[PDB]
Amino acid sequence: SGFRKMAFPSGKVEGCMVQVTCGTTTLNGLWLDDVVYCPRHVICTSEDMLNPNYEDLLIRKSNHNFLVQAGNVQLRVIGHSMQNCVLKLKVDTANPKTPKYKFVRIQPGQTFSVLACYNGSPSGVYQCAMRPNFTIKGSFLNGSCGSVGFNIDYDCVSFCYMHHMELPTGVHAGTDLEGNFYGPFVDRQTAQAAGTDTTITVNVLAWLYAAVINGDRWFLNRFTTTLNDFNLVAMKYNYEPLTQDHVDILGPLSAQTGIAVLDMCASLKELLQNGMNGRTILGSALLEDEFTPFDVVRQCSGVTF
Amino acid sequence: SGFRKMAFPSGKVEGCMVQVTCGTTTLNGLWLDDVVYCPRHVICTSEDMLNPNYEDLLIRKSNHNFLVQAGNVQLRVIGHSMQNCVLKLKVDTANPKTPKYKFVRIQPGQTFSVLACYNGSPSGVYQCAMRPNFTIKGSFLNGSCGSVGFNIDYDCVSFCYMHHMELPTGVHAGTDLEGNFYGPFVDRQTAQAAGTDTTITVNVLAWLYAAVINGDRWFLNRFTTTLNDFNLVAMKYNYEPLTQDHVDILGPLSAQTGIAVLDMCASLKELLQNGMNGRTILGSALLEDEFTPFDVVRQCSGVTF
Numbered sequence: 001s002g003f004r005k006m007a008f009p010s011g012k013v014e015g016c017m018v019q020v021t022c023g024t025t026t027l028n029g030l031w032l033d034d035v036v037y038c039p040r041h042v043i044c045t046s047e048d049m050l051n052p053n054y055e056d057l058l059i060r061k062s063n064h065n066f067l068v069q070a071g072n073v074q075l076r077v078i079g080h081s082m083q084n085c086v087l088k089l090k091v092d093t094a095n096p097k098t099p100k101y102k103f104v105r106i107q108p109g110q111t112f113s114v115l116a117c118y119n120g121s122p123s124g125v126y127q128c129a130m131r132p133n134f135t136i137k138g139s140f141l142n143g144s145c146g147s148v149g150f151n152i153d154y155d156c157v158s159f160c161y162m163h164h165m166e167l168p169t170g171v172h173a174g175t176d177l178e179g180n181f182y183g184p185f186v187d188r189q190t191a192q193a194a195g196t197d198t199t200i201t202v203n204v205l206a207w208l209y210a211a212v213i214n215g216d217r218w219f220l221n222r223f224t225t226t227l228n229d230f231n232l233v234a235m236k237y238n239y240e241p242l243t244q245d246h247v248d249i250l251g252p253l254s255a256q257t258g259i260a261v262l263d264m265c266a267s268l269k270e271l272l273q274n275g276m277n278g279r280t281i282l283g284s285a286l287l288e289d290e291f292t293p294f295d296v297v298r299q300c301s302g303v304t305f
Numbered sequence: 306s307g308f309r310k311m312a313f314p315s316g317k318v319e320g321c322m323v324q325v326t327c328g329t330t331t332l333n334g335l336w337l338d339d340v341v342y343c344p345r346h347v348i349c350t351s352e353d354m355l356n357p358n359y360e361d362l363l364i365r366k367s368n369h370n371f372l373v374q375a376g377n378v379q380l381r382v383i384g385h386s387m388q389n390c391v392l393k394l395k396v397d398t399a400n401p402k403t404p405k406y407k408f409v410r411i412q413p414g415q416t417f418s419v420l421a422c423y424n425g426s427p428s429g430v431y432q433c434a435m436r437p438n439f440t441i442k443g444s445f446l447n448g449s450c451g452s453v454g455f456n457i458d459y460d461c462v463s464f465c466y467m468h469h470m471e472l473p474t475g476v477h478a479g480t481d482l483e484g485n486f487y488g489p490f491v492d493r494q495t496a497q498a499a500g501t502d503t504t505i506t507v508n509v510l511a512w513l514y515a516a517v518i519n520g521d522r523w524f525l526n527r528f529t530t531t532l533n534d535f536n537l538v539a540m541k542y543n544y545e546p547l548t549q550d551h552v553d554i555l556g557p558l559s560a561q562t563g564i565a566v567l568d569m570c571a572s573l574k575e576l577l578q579n580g581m582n583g584r585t586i587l588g589s590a591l592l593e594d595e596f597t598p599f600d601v602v603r604q605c606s607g608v609t610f
């Protein structure tokens with residue numbers, strides 16, 4: 001039936017995007033109820049970027065220094081505050097398009113959809129994973145700050161990411177909606193080490209199960225392995241160690257296909273050691289780690305919102 | 306800055322999805338103004354599927370045999386007609402969420418976003434290409450019929466595809482919004498040959514330009530080629546012949562990067578003949594053909610809607 005990197009429908013989030021301007025800087029904001037959330041770096045200028053004193057810069061700002069526009073609707077700013085690396089602008093009108101929502105701090109390896117925006121307007125939507133080193137490999141240009149990542153559960157939008165910056169390496173960094181960065185990153189123009197990234201093993205296994213469900217079974221072999229033997233191979237190829245928790249999360253896919261999790265690990269061990277010999281799996285010539293076990297079940301079961 | 310398979314924001318299309326039921330069959334419909342569009346195969350049963358007589362089956366139906374539900378809003382069917390392979394149900398209420406829209410018949414090689422739906426509810430969004438053989442490699446399950454493909458140009462949605470069926474090969478087939486199938490396909494349960502597919506050469510070249518823009522330049526070599534020499538290699542590797550029209554469409558990317566189109570063709574020639582030697586381009590170990598030159602410019606220039 002096919003398997004695609006599927007994003008959540010973005011409608012509920014499109015209704016929340018606004019443009020925030022402070023002086024010469026314009027970026028995106030998220031309008032939920034009577035609060036607009038945006039990166040605090042909206043208040044810093046070219047001369048400040050290397051190490052802004054956000055407390056001092058914010059003290060020089062008043063409510064009328066923040067211009068918020070939702071499409072053509074001009075919002076009135078009646079309060080401002082900084083929470084970690086986000087600015088929270090209280091507005092005098094609750095967003096009539098506010099969906100049911102939660103703010104969540106996702107774990108590394110989990111996925112979410114990103115609605116990339118510029119000037120408070122949607123440009124596109126794509127699915128991505130929070131890397132183990134807390135970076136995201138997105139697609140973002142200047143002005144994309146304030147774009148958000150989210151997941152949907154029936155009618156509820158769980159916002160998990162707000163884009164802040166590109167690192168000199170071309171990867172992306174941001175915060176949860178309480179303004180806490182994912183990873184060791186700071187909101188200043190400096191070279192910052194992201195550190196060693198690894199492949200999300202439980203996601204690669206989930207994608208191998210998605211492949212079996214779709215008829216791509218060439219990689220199934222006559223071997224089995226142990227959790228400890230597989231983890232020796234995982235450490236060698238910079239893959240995350242597999243735990244019993246990960247095995248338990250793969251239970252539904254193991255049940256649907258009749259392939260024991262450790263048998264799928266022995267197939268993955270052979271692909272790591274021998275490569276793919278010019279073959280493809282679900283249209284890919286690499287081992288894909290951007291689908292969680294939940295993503296595979298949602299896509300293979302047609303879960304709606 | 307990264308490069309992702311980016312879909313259009315789906316909000317404008319989510320507001321148009323409805324559920325259409327006729328007897329025991331339920332699928333998706335598209336509600337635009339006072340007309341609901343859906344696959345005509347909504348009127349066929351398990352005993353008819355092999356070769357339905359759609360004219361006879363439709364004659365046995367009346368307006369009250371079609372139930373249309375938009376969320377929880379029950380629409381009143383006041384007219385029905387068949388146009389090619391689509392059914393057009395006239396309803397007594399114009400959709401208040403109707404966007405500015407056009408119906409278009411896309412050319413093979415062009416791309417569009419698909420909003421996959423079940424029971425009139427959105428499940429996900431993804432970008433895909435109309436293959437040269439007029440199939441689509443989507444992600445669709447039973448009940449996905451009536452889901453649509455579209456492109457957006459500022460505030461206008463151009464609908465180009467309505468999903469009808471999966472072929473026994475696992476690829477997907479459908480129609481434009483006037484009910485004409487793309488390709489030689491018919492709406493019946495039979496084995497149908499899609500014929501030889503080829504790789505969309507102009508799209509592979511556009512993606513190589515996107516790679517150069519993002520700093521992946523390892524594949525740039527010291528060779529050049531001619532349009533005729535490159536076409537000898539294209540025929541050998543089942544790639545579409547490149548024409549001057551394709552060279553002209555790549556003009557903006559050639560200008561932005563300073564790499565002449567024929568020089569990029571000589572790089573592509575070397576990748577086809579020598580493979581990628583275990584290297585990747587924009588995170589892929591295969592040559593990607595699902596980005597048009599327009600898609601690359603939109604993504605690299607941050608075009609909003």
Ligand SMILES: *c1cc(-c2ncccc2C)n2ncc(C3CCCCC3)c2n1
Pocket residue numbers: 041044049140141142143144145164165166167187188189306
């Ligand atoms: C907003 C957006 C971006 C950005 N994201 C992706 C690609 C390019 C760019 C420029 N940003 N990158 C860095 C920053 C900085 C500005 C100075 C304060 C710290 C964050 C940024 N903002």
Ligand SMILES: *c1cc(-c2ncccc2C)n2ncc(C3CCCCC3)c2n1
Pocket residue numbers: 001346349354445446447448449450469470471472492493494
């Ligand atoms: C609707 C949806 C699908 C479908 N799409 C993707 C994956 C699985 C399935 C079943 N359909 N496939 C075939 C058809 C037929 C039904 C009988 C008439 C011709 C079309 C279909 N409808």
